Amino acid sequence: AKSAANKLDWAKVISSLRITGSTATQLSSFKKRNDEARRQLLELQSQPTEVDFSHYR
Amino acid sequence: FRDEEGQDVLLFIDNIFRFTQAGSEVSALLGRIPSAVGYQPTLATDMGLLQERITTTKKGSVTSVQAVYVPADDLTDPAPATTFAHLDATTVLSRGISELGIYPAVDPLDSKSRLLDAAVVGQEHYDVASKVQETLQTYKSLQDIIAILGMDELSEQDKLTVERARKIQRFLSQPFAVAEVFTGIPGKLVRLKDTVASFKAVLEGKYDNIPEHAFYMVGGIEDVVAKAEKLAAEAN
Amino acid sequence: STPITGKVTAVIGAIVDVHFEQSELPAILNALEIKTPQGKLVLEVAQHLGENTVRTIAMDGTEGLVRGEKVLDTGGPISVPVGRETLGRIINVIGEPIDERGPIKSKLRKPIHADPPSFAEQSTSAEILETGIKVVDLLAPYARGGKIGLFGGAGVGKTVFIQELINNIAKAHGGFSVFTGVGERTREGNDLYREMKETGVINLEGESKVALVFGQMNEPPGARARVALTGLTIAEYFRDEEGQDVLLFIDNIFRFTQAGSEVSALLGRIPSAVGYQPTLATDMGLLQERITTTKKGSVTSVQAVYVPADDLTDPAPATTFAHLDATTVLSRGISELGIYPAVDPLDSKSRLLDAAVVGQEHYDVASKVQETLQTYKSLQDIIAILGMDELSEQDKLTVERARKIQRFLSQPFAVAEVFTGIPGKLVRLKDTVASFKAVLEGKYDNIPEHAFYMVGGIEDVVAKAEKLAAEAN
Amino acid sequence: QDLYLRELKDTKLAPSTLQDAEGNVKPWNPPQKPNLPELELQGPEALKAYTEQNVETAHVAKESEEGESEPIEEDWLVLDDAEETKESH
Amino acid sequence: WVRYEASLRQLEQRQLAKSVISRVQSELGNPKFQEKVLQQSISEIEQLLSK
Amino acid sequence: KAQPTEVSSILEERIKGVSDEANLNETGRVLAVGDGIARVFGLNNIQAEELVEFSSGVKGMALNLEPGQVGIVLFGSDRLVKEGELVKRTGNIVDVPVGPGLLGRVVDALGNPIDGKGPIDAAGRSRAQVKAPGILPRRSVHEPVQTGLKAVDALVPIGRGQRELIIGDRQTGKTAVALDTILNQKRWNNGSDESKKLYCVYVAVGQKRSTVAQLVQTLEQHDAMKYSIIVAATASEAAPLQYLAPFTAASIGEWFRDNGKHALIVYDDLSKQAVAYRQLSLLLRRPPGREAYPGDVFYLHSRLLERAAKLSEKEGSGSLTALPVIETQGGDVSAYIPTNVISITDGQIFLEAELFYKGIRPAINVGLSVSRVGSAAQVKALKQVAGSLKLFLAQYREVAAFAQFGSDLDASTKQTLVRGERLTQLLKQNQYSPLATEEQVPLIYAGVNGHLDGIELSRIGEFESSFLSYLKSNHNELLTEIREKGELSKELLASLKSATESFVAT
Amino acid sequence: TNVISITDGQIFLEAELFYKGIRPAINVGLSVSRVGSAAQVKALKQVAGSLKLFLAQYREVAAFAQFGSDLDASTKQTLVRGERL
Ligand SMILES: Nc1ncnc2c1ncn2[C@@H]1O[C@H](COP(=O)(O)OP(=O)(O)O)[C@@H](O)[C@H]1O
Ligand SMILES: Nc1ncnc2c1ncn2[C@@H]1O[C@H](COP(=O)(O)OP(=O)(O)O)[C@@H](O)[C@H]1O
Ligand SMILES: [Mg+2]
């Protein structure tokens, strides 16, 4: 579902060779990238957030 | 097979050196004083007893191919060094040439055979092989002078000889059909006459302009020309 | 009780054969006593030869031993006094005090032969031991609970290196330290004992937080072999029963292997490679595995390996490399050019050189230092043959920078002021990593390489450069 | 088997007061009733952070801040800054 | 808590090993050198009855 | 604690039953016990290399059976054993417990648990000395072993049943690359497909106990101890234990191999096993061969390694992958033990300090590191796909042959030098960072197109991480496509080229 | 190697220095003392404290004599001092 959003974002980036000199658009890009990377890292590393009282207790 | 059946035999023994290794292995516990390099005292004896029974008699012929493993890449080890005298055609595979990318790894200098005679392979074949050998020898004598000082200091004739010998060394590599696992290029069957013609053409300087890469991992001189053309096409 | 009397049958150099009667055979490594006129001689049962004959190794000189002399079995292996009583005392292999300060009033005497603590280990190899030596604080960090090798051949400077290690660490360490002096110079031991006495490290009428073991190379092979074991007994008793972090100190761990080969030559064993004892690996592992962190307490080891004939491939130095968390290889070639200590920057190595423990900054600085030094060594051949001109600008800059770092690796030691002539410097880890980071960026390229010679931090480099540029020039 | 039964009840009675019966511990003088159940019960808490981790202190997530409701100054400043850089594309 | 309980099991095994010395000393002073000899003799007799 | 009680009762009842029916008469009596070995008279019916039990409790094993006396190597210290002590022959050749319960446990040479985690649950007992599979039962190595490091996977791939030697100098990354190979298997071992699961067996022969603790904790952290097996032969442990531990671990791996499972056994060190066996021979009165090494160090290494093979479908299609090590002395590849083991293993992985300090973090010496199965035992997406990935090794050899020492001939030579430098820059991989093939393939492809215009060599380290992140974002379809299908289609190659161009543009 | 490992210092004597003309030879750099430095005569220590530095400086400078040039004034002074030394 996220593929369309960043696909169009980098399509705008490919169009953005002419609006060069911007300050925080690229900064906001790395901000989104860092936030989504932290998303997928926390979702991958997240073990089942419950104590297995049947066995692990 | 040779004597009773009266048929030509190809006795392929892979790494015959294991026989002498096992002989030296059991010799220590057999109450035998070890020989040099910790080998059995009888190494020449039992090894020759094995090797002589491999021969062509009046009843049949045995075209045996025996691989020999040299310990520590040392060609002076007693087992292979003594095995050399028991062998008609010799093909030495040194690690150094293999390290340069030549996958057949056959060092062209010590790879010598008794058949290399003008009365056997022909005068032109002997001349081409001898010219190749002197080119590689001149290259090898110029290892250190090029490595530590530079190819620029050599004379124009010496530079030409060095580059021709580089081309030859690349041309020695040949695609083996069973070696597609490593090369990734289909194996080629270069004929004897084709090889002689290609190498006499290269020695004559006919293809000095062709880059050294085009001789890498190829078959005949036609394959060299095709690879050079492909390289020029992709380089643009 | 009933004494176990044995008769001497063979005296082969340092090895004595003892014959007993039926069912009185001492086990392997038991201690046997003979009442020699000069005192008592202790024999350790090395092998059972059969027919109720035991092959033993002498703890002292075998002169004056007559075949058939009575041999008394102590009932167990050699027992060395242990506890805080032994702190500040000098003890030989046997266990009797040799400091002429009266007998040691130790409550217990643990045997010198003990099993390793097995899998009671901890993976606590993450605490950097700040020694003050900038090269080891950067290239090969030392572990508080690990083992330090400190390799080197003749000369090189291994003894001053270890002495500097005590001077920087044991003065302000939270625990006790043990020095064994395995097959070294007796004058060196006397000087180093006096040095601790002056610093207050060993206070005769005081705490005296350090126990000393000796029996230097003037002693027979059996001594040089078992002095490491008795020092290990001291260290293990302090480590387990006292629960204290112990600073082991072995001045030459190689001498144990040398003595083992010496006795094996007379033990009827076919020699191993380079004529060593076949069990060299086995005894070496048994020795080193008594030096472990263990659940209770911790040990720092700190070895000093002598490479025979400056051969790093010698079987004993090759074997000890495995049993060492960090090593400090001192190369004689570096010693020739004068960079002291003569530690090889790209042969020391340490398991602690990982970003998780180091911090990814000091690790990167060390990696780039190794980069420059490896490139320098690779280019030495053409530098000698051709010169610096043939190299491109990048290679020339790299060679000059690597020369600067290699000069900077030299550090004055407080125990070597008589040799350097310059007061010793103790460089903190953060100081040296910052200094070498600044050097790597090229901030001090204009400064001559000689300003890095016998200096401490980068501030000392700047000071020396200014002095050379103004007062000298 | 005399070699068996006597060693068996010896190995049963020696820890009987230790484990089966509540007779403290006879083989060694130091008490065990107030030591492993009581003194070592906080052993995992002693090695770890007592009253800091075993309680699993739950910090409520801090509310994520934003533009702080600035619909005029922020937009105008962004437009002006983009105008400054648009003349030098 | 899991490896604390594991260490507790290790410690109780170690304390049983410590009490093993008292167990051994119990039979050391026990005049056991007569009943044990008879039992091992009759065990040997039973062993050789099959053979 | 009823468990110690009933286990003690059962063991003592078994002892009573053994005493009731023993009739041991030809049992031996020790004549002369040396340094960890004893010569014993008697045992007229002893089998060769049969386990024995000394009266002191130390176990033994019979290498040389001289007339009258037999040499017993002790699996422990010689403290307890004395002259005239009774020795009890176990009646069976030395074996090691094997099965799936060994997973998650650390055991000694004999297989006894040393991690203090309880008794070992074994599906059976397999001989420590087991004949290697014959010519027919094996199968050609085709299934790759995903090591997770770029250089070794691209240049010297390891497959199921292959024997690849990690030959190198001291502390040059041998056990490190062994560890990355060990850890990379967590991707498949956490799944359900047993045909892709690859159980691990580490052989810590000659390593110190602190190193083994480091190892076991490192495997514990990265969820790897559950599928790995640690056979530790401590240097302090008796030399016969060091000699035997790799054989017992080989039997343990053969258990997985014969049951349709794939096992990776890393014969780490094995030079310590070599010297331990040298000690065994040199106190067993066996005259040595070269440099005081006994005659059958070659036979020993070959017989031990040949047990690792890829079984055929008729034999369950199982595999047993060997990763032996050689600790060379000063980079001496041309030494007896090194070249001996190289002649056994299906290729070698060379590591020297030269490349280690030169920057190459895997320290992969592409020259002397060769794999005997290049096209096979490799991921299809990584083998040739675009052709250049196949002659990758030949290109590296060319780059070595015309490195900076060679004269920069022309623009083609400059481009070749830049390509080689960027490629060796790419191959560096941080420790404990197994990089999967679905992520390896885009990076290797980027080393052929878009590699030359890299902004400084040092920045390729962060460029690799950024390219991984780029492939993760709205390109995970490509990653899973190359992970699942295995081969790369023409449209897939075009998409990868487009992604590489888009990234290099940024 | 082992003898150096025992003794308290070494006095190396170059063969080329013997052949070059330096009759006592003695490599001033390789030769080194451990415990005689504290035992050295105090006046001799005062007058020879910097002698080691000058000889080391010559040992470094003599590797610069190939490119006979100005060589900077300091190196020329060190050479013209250490040769007389
Ligand atoms: N910090 C230092 N400063 C100057 N010289 C040193 C230093 N440390 C060691 N040395 C040198 O070490 C050499 C011999 O040292 P030592 O280690 O005692 O010999 P060995 O290793 O044979 O026992 C001497 O020549 C001395 O100059
Ligand atoms: N990615 C890496 N690959 C190899 N070695 C690394 C890596 N990162 C760090 N190292 C360092 O290199 C050393 C590797 O040596 P190691 O594999 O332990 O050899 P040995 O076990 O023979 O001593 C380690 O001590 C480690 O600190
Ligand atoms: Mg010394």
Ligand SMILES: [Mg+2]
């Ligand atoms: Mg390793």
